[PDB]
Symmetry: D3
C-alpha cells in the first residue's frame, strides 16, 4: 500500500495532475496518490515549502512526497531525492499527530523528491536528512523528458518508482550538502522586548494571518498562552489580545484572536470571521509582537 | 474497501486536507477517502449541510461521512457521530441512485461525524437517525488536540477509526436528541397562490439558481411539470417559463428554464448559459413563485 | 485494478462530483477514481476535449475515461462509449510517456464514455476507435435518469460498469461514424507566410499562452527551434523571441519564451513569470506568427 | 454674454479641456464656457449625440454648442458648423424649458460645431437646420492644426470665433445635406402588440435604464400613463409595472417604476434605488415592452 | 455679480447639469455658476448635506446655494428656499475664511434652495435661518414640471430667479420650522471613556478617514492635541498615534496621522499616502477612539 | 477679466474645490476660474507637473495658474509664486496655439503659484522664470491657515489676490534658485541607435501610451514622420509602425499608431481603440524607440 503525497504548482484546471497520476499508477499499480495541493503560486518555492514541511508526521512511514514547482524545467537540472531523518513533531504544542498520544513516526521513514531548487529547504532544516541523491537514472526518469514538464518527468515519474520500491541510492549520485540548493529564511529578529517577523501566509479560506514568529521565538521571549500581546501588522496596525489557544477565546464572533496556528506559529485572526480579506492584509507585511 | 467521504471548509490551497487524509490512511490503511468538497464558505453550517444531506444513497453501505466546518474548534465542544436511519430516495422524482432501478440502501448503513454545531441538521431531518454519540474517547481523538484544527482532531481522525471498524457506540456517551444542535430552516410560505422562499444556492459552476421551494411545496399549490410560472428574484427581477424537467426544454440556448433540480427543488436557469452570473444573482435573494 | 479517469464540468464546490464517485465505488468497488479536472468552462466541448485527448498514454491499460459536459442533459440524447485504437504518443517531440523509453500502450486499451455532443472529437481524431456504442442499457444507466444530471446518470454510472468489466458492446447498439457528433476545429490559416491561429488556451496557473498553431504548422512553414519569431496576439500585442524548447531558454526571469508546449503547439510565456495575466490575454484572441 | 457649451470625449483627468477653454477665453474674452460633459466613451458618436441633442431649449439664444469626439483627428476631414432650425420642445410632455410656461426659443438661435462624423445626426433630425458650413477658414482654425487634437483645433477654437461673432457663413463653404455624415438609428419595431427596442443608455449615476422606445412609439400601441406593462431586458430579465410619471409612483423604495424619462423615452428604474447596477444591466441590451 | 453654487446628484456623465446651467444663465444672464460637486451618492441626503453645510463663509455674500438630491421628484413635494442666518466659522480651529484674519460674512447673506427632504438639516442646524419658504410660484418653477427632473425644475430654475433678485418671500408661502424635513444624525455615544462613532466619510481622493467624532466630543473627553489615541475602525482595525494638526506630523511618508479635518472632526490618515484604499475602509464603519 | 486656471489634487467629489473658488470670487470678484483638473494622483508632483507645464500658450496673458498638490500642508513650508519667462510654443511641431498662425504670447506674462515642492519643476525648466517669491504675506494668505488645507490657504487664496492685481514681489521674499525645490527628471538615454525612456502617462480616457521621449530626442536621432520605428514597451512588446502624425494613419480601426502627441512626445496608440486599457499598460513601463 504505497502512498505518494503529491504537491505541485500544476493547478486544478487541466489534465496536468492527472497525467502525473496516470504515470504514478502505471509505475506503482498499488499506489495511493494523496493530493496535497496544486494551487501554490507558481515558482514560489518558499510557499511550496510551507505546504510540504509538516507532512511526514501525518503519513504512514514509507510515504513518498512528490513535491514540485519546476521553473527550471527543460534544463540540465535534475531533481533531488532525499530520505529525511526526523519525521518531527509539530503543531502549537509540538506533538505527534493522531488519536491518543499520536503516531510516533520512525526516523529515516520518508522520502521527498523535488526539483533541486530550494523547495525542500525547510523540509531539510526541520527534519534533517540521512541521504540525498540526484535523480538521473533512466530507470526512474524519461530518457527524453518533456522540456516543459519536469514536474511530471523528474518528480512524478521517479516518485512512483520510489514508491514501488526502487532503491533511493540508485536514482543517481549522492549529493553533498552544498549541492542541495537552499533559499534563505529571514530570521525573526529580537528588536527590544519585541519579536520582529513577517506575515508569512494568509491562511485560506479563512483569512487568518500567519506569521513566521514561532512558538520557540515566543517561549524564549517568555510569551505563553495568557500573555497580553500587542501584535503590530503592516507597521501601523497594533492588535491587542491575549495569546489564546483558539479563535473562540476572543469571545464574540469577529473579535481578534492572537494564537498559535497548527504549524506552531504566531497567528492572528478573528473569531469565526475573516481578518485578512476585508482589509486586504497580505503575506510579506511586517509582524512585530511584544508583551 | 471502507470509504470516508470528506467534506470540509479547509480549502484546496494548502496541506490541511492532506494532513487529514494522511491520518485517515494511517488509522485505516485500506480506506478510500472521497472528497466531497472543501471550498464551502467557512463557518456556514447551512451551506455545508447542503453538500452532505443527499450523499448517502450514492455511497456504498458502511460509508462514513466526515463533514466539518468547525468554528468552535479548540473549545470543550465535541463532535457528534450518528448512524442515520434511511439513506432516503432523492432527486426530482425521488428514487434510489444508480443504474436500473437504483441501488436500494439498507437502513442504518451510514455514519456521519461532524461538529455538533447544526451541520447535520438536514441530514437528521431527511434520513432520521438510529443512534448518536458524543465523540470523546481518546481511542478516536487526540489526547491533546490541536486547538485550531478540530476538523482534523475531532472529525477526520475519529472518522478514520469509525471506518477502521471502531464500534460507533464506543466513541463517547449517547447524545439525547435535544443535545444535537440544529439550525432553523426558513419555511416556504404560502402567500395567496404564491410560494415564497429564498435563493438557497447559486449552482456553481453553471450559475443556475436553486431555491428552497421543494417539489412537495409545488404539488401543494397544484404545480407540476408544464405549468406556466412567474418566478421573481430579489423582489424585482421576475421570470416566466413553464416548469420543465431539464434545461433544454427552454428551447434556444440562453432561454429561461424553470425546473426541479437534482435534489428536488424549484430552480431557474438559462439553457446552456449562466443565469446567476451576468445578473449577479446571489444566495439569500427572495424567490417567489406563482402559477 | 480498475481506473476511471474523471473529467467533468461539475466543479469542485458541491457534492456533484462526490455523488458520481460514490456510485462509481458502489458499482466497481475496487476502482480508483482519478480526477482529471472538474473546472472546465461549462458546456465548452472544445475545452473539455483538450483536457482528455492526451490522457490515454499516461494511464494503465484498461482505464476508462468518464468525460462529460452534458448541456443536453434530460433529453433523448444518449452517451456514446468508444474503445479508442492507438493510445498515441504526444508531447513536443511525440513520444510514449514514462521513465526509460517510456511505456508503450497496446491498441484498444481505453474506453471513453461521454455525451454524444462532440466532446470526443479530438480523442477520435487523434486516437481512432475500434468500436462505438450508444449507452442505453438499463444495466448501465438508470431507468429513471435524473433529468438535469446526465453527467452522473449517463457517464459516471455507466463508466463504473465499464470499469467493472461490463462488456462494452452490451451498453447499447453500435453507432455508425456519422452518428458520433463532432465539432469543427478552425484551421490555422495562411496570410502571406504568417500563420494565423488563435489563443486556444491560457495555460493556468502559469499564464502561458497556448495557440492552436502546431509543431507541424511551423515546420511545414520552415520554422524550427532557434528561429526568430514575431508573435502578435489579439491583433495588437507583439512579442519576438527565438523558438526554444523551454522557458528558461529566455534567460532572465520574466523574459519572453516562444516554445512548443507539452501538447506540441506554439506557445508563448515569460520565463518563470506570468505572461497572460498582467496583459489580460485570453483564449480566443488571434495569434499571428511569422519568421 | 456669449456661451459655448462644450461636450467632448477629452476626459476630466488632464489639461485637455483646459487647453480648449484657455483658447476659448482667448478668442472670445466675454465668453462663458459651460461644460456639458467630457466623460463620453471615446469615439462613440451615438452616445455623444445623446448628450447634445436636447441642449438647445435650455440655453439662451445665440449659444454655440462645441460638441466633439474626433477619431478622424489629423485627417483632411473638417468640422461642420450648423445653425439649427427649431430649438424644439422636449421632455415627457414636450414643452419649453424654464419657469412658468417655459422659455420659447426663436428659430435659428443655436449653432453646433462638430466633427463631421455623424455626431450631429440626432441634432439635425430633431431640430432641423437652416445652414451648414464646412469649417476650413484659417480665421477660425489653426493653419497648422495639432494632428491628434482636432477637438481643440477644429471645434473648440472655431466655436470661440463663432461665439465671438465670426459670421457663420464665413467659416467655410456651404455643405449640402448629403455631405453631413449621419449615423443610422435603430428603429423601434412593432412585434405583434410588443415594441422592441434597446437599452439606449444606463442613466448614471442612478442606474436607471433608458430605452430608445419613445412616448410617440408608446401612444402608437395605445400606451399611456397607467398601463400595466411587461418590459423584458437582455431577452430574459422581465419587469412588470404600470407606466407612471415618476419613480415614487412605484411606492416603496426599491420598487420597479416604468416611466417616461426627461427626454421622452420609456425607461425603467427602481424607486430611489439603482436598477442597472446590482444586475449589471447594460446599454445595448434588448428591451421589449408589451401591454 | 450673482453666484449660484450648485451641488447635485446629477453626476458628471451626461447633459443633466448642463441643462440646469443653461436655464440658470437664461434666467440670470450675469450669473456665475460654481459647481460644488455632482458626484454624491444619489439620494444620500446626509452625504449631500456634508458638501454644502460649510460653503457660506467661502462665498461672496448673496450667493445662492442650489443643492439637490431629489428622490421625491415628480411628487407633490415642493422645494424649500431658506435665507440662512450666520455664515458661520469652521475649520479645525473655528475661523472666518480668507487671507488676513479672514473675511467676515454679514448674517442673512445666503439662500439655500433644496428639496424639502432633510438635505438642509445640517445647514439649518449650523447656520440658523431668517426665513424659509415653499417654492411654488410659477414665476420661479415650471407650470408643467418634468416629473423626473425636480432637481432642475424645483432647484436649478428657481435658484437662478433667486440669484437674479427675485424676492425670496414671493417664491411661495412661509414654512413653519416643523414643515422643514430634518434627518437625525446619530450621536457619538459613550462606552467607558471611549468615544464610539462612525466613519462619516472616506475623504476622496486621499483615502483619509473622517469620523463623526468632533473636536468638541474630544475636548469634552479631555483629548487635546498631543494625546496618544487608539483609533479602532470597523470594530477590527486598530491604529495608534498622537492627535496632531496635520499629516506631515506623522513623520515618514505613510505613517499614521490622527488629526482634526478641515471640517473639525477626528480623522485618520497616512502621511502623503492613502489609508482607506489599501484597507478598503468605508463610510459607515464604526470608529472607536480612546486615550 | 482676470483668469485663474486651477489645477489641484482635491478631487471632484466634495466641496474642496468650491471652497477655493468661493474664496477666489470673494477676493477677485471679476475672476474667471478655469478648472484644469482636480483628479491628479494625490501627491504625485511629477503627474501634476504634466497637467500644468503646457498651459501658458493657451491662456490670455496675465493668467494666474493656481496649481497644487500639498502633502506638506500644515507645516512651515510656504508656496512659491513665480513669473515665468517664455510662454513657450508646443505640440508635435512646436507652434503657438490658436487659429491662423496662433496666439504669440509675450514673455513674463504668466504667474504660477504652487507649493514649493517641485510641482513647478518642468514649468521652470521649460518656461524659465523672471522672479520667484515665497508666499508669506498676511495680505495674501490666512494668518491662521487651516493645517490640512494649504491648497486653499497657500495657493487658492493668494492666487486670487495675484489675479486681483496684488504685486507679485510683495507676496514675500524673493527666492534664490536653489530654494525652489525641483524633482529630478530622468533623461532619455542614448543606448545605441535607440532612445530609451519610459511610459510617462497613460492618456485618459483613450488609453493612448505617452512616453517621455521628446520630438527633440527623435529629431537628433534623425527620426521624423515616415520613419519606420520599433517602439518596445515594457521590455517585451515591440511595436512596429511608421511614425505618423495621427491615429488614422494606421489605417483600419484598432491598428497601431506611433505618433507625436499634442505635448510633443513620442506616443503609441491604436486607431480609434484603446491600446493601454485592454492590456493594462501603465506609466513607468520602459519605452525604447529605434529606427
Ligand atoms: N512560464 C513558465 N516558466 C517557468 N516554468 C514554468 C512556466 N510554466 C510552467 N512552468 C513549470 O513547468 C513545470 C511546472 O511545474 C511549472 O513550474
Ligand atoms: N478564524 C476562525 N474562527 C473560527 N474557526 C476557524 C477560524 N479559522 C479556521 N477555523 C476553523 O478551524 C477548523 C476549520 O474547519 C475552521 O472552520
Ligand atoms: N443551465 C444549464 N444548461 C444546460 N446544461 C446544464 C445546465 N446546468 C447544468 N448543466 C449540465 O448538467 C450536467 C452537467 O454536466 C452540466 O453540463
Ligand atoms: N430611480 C430614481 N429614484 C428616485 N429618484 C431618482 C431616481 N433617478 C433619479 N432620481 C432623482 O431625479 C432628480 C435627481 O436629483 C435624482 O435624485
Ligand atoms: N493624507 C494626506 N497626507 C498629506 N497630504 C494630504 C493628505 N490628504 C490631503 N492632503 C493634502 O491636503 C491639501 C491637499 O492638496 C492634499 O494634497
Ligand atoms: N487613439 C485614438 N484614435 C483616434 N482618435 C483619438 C485617439 N485618441 C484620441 N483621439 C481623438 O483625438 C481628439 C479627441 O477628441 C479624441 O477623440
Amino acid at each position: 500500500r504505497p502512498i505518494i503525497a503529491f504537491m505541485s504548482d500544476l493547478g486544478t484546471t487541466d489534465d496536468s495532475v492527472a497525467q502525473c497520476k496516470g504515470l504514478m499508477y502505471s509505475i506503482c499499480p498499488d499506489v495511493t496518490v494523496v493530493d496535497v495541493c496544486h494551487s501554490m503560486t507558481p515558482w514560489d518555492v518558499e510557499e511550496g515549502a510551507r505546504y510540504i514541511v509538516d507532512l511526514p508526521r501525518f503519513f504512514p512511514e514509507g510515504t513518498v512526497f512528490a513535491t514540485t514547482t519546476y521553473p527550471a524545467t527543460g534544463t540540465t537540472t535534475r531533481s533531488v531525492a532525499v530520505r529525511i531523518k526526523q519525521a518531527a513533531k509539530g503543531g502549537a504544542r509540538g506533538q505527534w499527530a493522531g488519536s491518543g498520544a499520536g503516531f510516533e513516526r520512525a526516523e529515516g521513514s520518508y522520502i521527498y523528491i523535488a526539483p533541486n531548487n530550494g523547495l525542500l529547504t525547510t523540509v531539510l532544516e526541520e527534519h534533517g536528512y540521512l541521504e540525498a541523491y540526484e535523480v538521473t537514472s533512466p530507470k526512474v526518469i524519461p530518457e527524453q523528458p518533456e522540456p516543459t514538464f519536469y514536474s511530471r518527468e523528474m518528480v512524478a515519474i521517479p516518485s512512483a518508482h520510489l514508491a514501488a520500491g526502487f532503491p533511493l541510492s540508485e536514482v543517481g549520485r549522492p549529493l553533498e550538502d552544498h549541492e542541495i540548493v537552499r533559499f534563505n529564511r529571514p530570521a525573526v529578529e529580537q528588536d527590544g522586548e519585541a519579536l520582529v517577523g513577517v506575515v508569512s501566509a494568509i491562511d485560506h479560506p479563512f483569512g487568518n494571518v500567519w506569521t513566521n514568529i514561532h512558538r520557540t521565538d515566543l517561549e524564549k521571549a517568555g510569551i505563553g498562552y495568557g500573555a497580553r500581546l500587542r501584535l503590530t501588522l503592516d507597521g501601523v496596525l497594533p492588535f491587542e489580545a491575549p495569546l489564546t489557544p483558539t479563535f473562540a477565546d476572543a469571545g464574540e464572533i469577529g473579535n481578534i484572536a492572537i494564537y498559535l496556528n497548527s504549524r506552531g506559529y504566531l497567528s492572528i485572526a478573528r473569531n469565526a470571521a475573516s481578518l485578512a480579506y476585508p482589509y486586504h492584509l497580505k503575506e510579506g507585511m511586517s509582524a512585530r509582537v511584544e508583551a
